[model samples]
Target: NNLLSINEIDNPNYILQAIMLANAFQNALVPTSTDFGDALRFSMPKGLEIANTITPMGAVVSYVDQNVTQTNNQVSVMINKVLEVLKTVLGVALSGSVIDQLTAAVTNTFTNLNTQKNEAWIFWGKETANQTNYTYNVLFAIQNAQTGGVMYCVPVGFEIKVSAVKEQVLFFTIQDSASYNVNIQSLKFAQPLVSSSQYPI
Candidate 1:
């Protein structure tokens, strides 16, 4: 019988949920000025610009002044915080293996950014390219199983650009995408059942 199985990181739903939670956390952080600054400080490298772009949904948030190493470090820190938030919010709904996979992927990206000689050709044009940029579209879809209500989170653009101007500086941007029509009540009904122990039966 297929009674027992281990939770694998290859599960699309798990990874999609993780990305959604991360993006949601990013969205939530934008509203609070103090908290947002504090979180940015925690992730950024030393001797870098503290000024960062903050905007509403469907806008862009940008940061500047960092190298590939520093930028990847900041990215890792941001992802780590996202994972922590997911663990707390979803509890057992998210698995440890998923976290491990995320961590490994971040590390791999750092390695690739540093060691890949052809990255310049891939991002820019020549081996002596002065500037390079990477773009990732933040896209995810979530469906309420019981109600069949679906929500899609799609970003217009997300980019990490690095330039050599005396000192290497990194520019990062995440732009939110346009909205779509969704059934609000179906989503509300999809919420987890309230514990009976918390209220009088």
Candidate 2:
């Protein structure tokens, strides 16, 4: 029955989610617990008090991920559309290898730019340690393009469901069990966890 608290930091996902919610519902966020402890309760304001805040250093750590997730998707869609049109109209005259290279170059360039844009949003709300109440100091730089804002409300006794799983593993047999039901296991790598609730109206 509590509004989700949020802030700008290593919590880029939280910031993006909050931005989406605020934009969709015409609202602005005000922090409840600033210092830390995953409780920057973002209460809705009457009007979208547009403020500009800068990003913190090392936020680019997530830039690579942004390129993979956002930029790659955007690039793939564009490249596919181009290939589809050219192949149909030109009767397959286009060279597949050349087009592949060209599209790759374009995708890389776009990825860099899109990654910058995503990281930019977080940097705009940059902050650092401060008093326990309002720990993350954010100076909202008044800007144009600000939209309608409202305070969201969550009723008491609301059901807050939480699902958490620590790990997932893979068990495979490489090429017919290899004499023992064991084969190959690949590796990979990964957070700041935020739990909040808001009743959609």
Candidate 3:
């Protein structure tokens, strides 16, 4: 037992070679890091006359029009009509939660307006208010940071038609064709992040 387990090789060159191979393999395993352009610059394209001033982030543009509805239950019909038309905007789907909130907002706004007998506020606020329009800015990749890349896109545009009737109470109905301003085509990285073995950076 006192005799040690010293069956190790006495050659220093073996350890040195082993370490050199280890370091070489280590260097080969980890690739050099590349720098991508800053992501904070993702923004609405320049020189666009966008109404509402809100960006493409899914937000409800709330408007209440009591006078526009031709019947007592006309607001619900209009709400549903508007929701259906807005199922997708500029290649983006209106999430279920957003639809739900939009419905609730319209419903509550109409109820409170009716309860307070403020129906006249709807007509007077026309043009300046009483209109809910959702505008979006969609960016397309026109080029890449790497050399010899390609890019092109049409400007963002949206045209929506919303119409509804009381069905029987729906005999009277309202229909509107609304269009929003278009955003100019711009350039952004096609693939902003570099690919790697591991998932999700």
Candidate 4:
């Protein structure tokens, strides 16, 4: 069968599906005492790769203090930490132009999330004029302490069967009185289209 191809940006419904999964992950977090952690691995369906550009977007916050200003500052710090870690992972896992595009998109997403408002939906990603043939697992994690939490919504429409591996450690950190909630949303595609002319069929 010929490979099924379509520009992800052209499909808004698909994009919204990804966002909904992220929101589901955010809502699934359960708080507990001491340290808690969760991780999500995003993998492309068979015969497909995200290729050229990947966008990771989501919300994060810390609710430790009573004062509005202090709480806001705390949320800002947590967002920064998440941003830093995201870039670091991208740098380690990807290289060349893809890295630059991914870094910029992720950076901008977090920057807006930090500056405009916390706990609000934010998104930015690169859609290359010409798609490429490269892809990798997009992993996410939230290690929580008692005081704060972060919700990351990466709308990269990919999937990996959970049954393949028993465990994965996407991110980890130990902080005093820390608590966080994180979940992974798995995306799957139906069999690739046999016909070349139709999309969203």
Measured on C-alpha atoms, candidate 4 has an lDDT of 0.26
lDDT of 4 by residue, 1-201 (tens): 011111222233343433333333333222222222122223222112331122233222211101111121332343344444444432342223244444444333223322422222311111123211111123232111211222222323211111111111111112111122222222222211121222233
Considering lDDT, which of the candidate structures 3 and 4 is the better prediction for this target? 4
By lDDT, is 1 or 2 better?
1
* Higher-scoring candidate on TM-score, 1 or 3: 1
Question: Please, what are the lDDT tens digits per residue for candidate 2 over residues 34-67?
Answer: 2222322222232222211111111111000001
User: Which runs of model 1 end up more than 4 angstroms from their true locations?
Assistant: 1-92, 114-131, 136-158, 163-201
Which clashing pairs does model 1 show? Answer: none
Error of 1 at 23 (Å): 22
Best by TM-score: 1
- lDDT at residue 136 of model 3 (Cα atoms): 18
Residues 126-161, model 3: lDDT tens digits: 121223221112221112222122211112211111
TM-score of model 1 (CA atoms):
0.27
Candidate ranking under TM-score, highest first, comes to 1, 3, 4, 2
Candidates 2 and 3 compared by TM-score, better number? 3
Q: What's the TM-score of each model vs. the native?
A: 0.27, 0.17, 0.24, 0.24
Candidate 4, residue 87: how far the Cα is off, in Å: 3.9
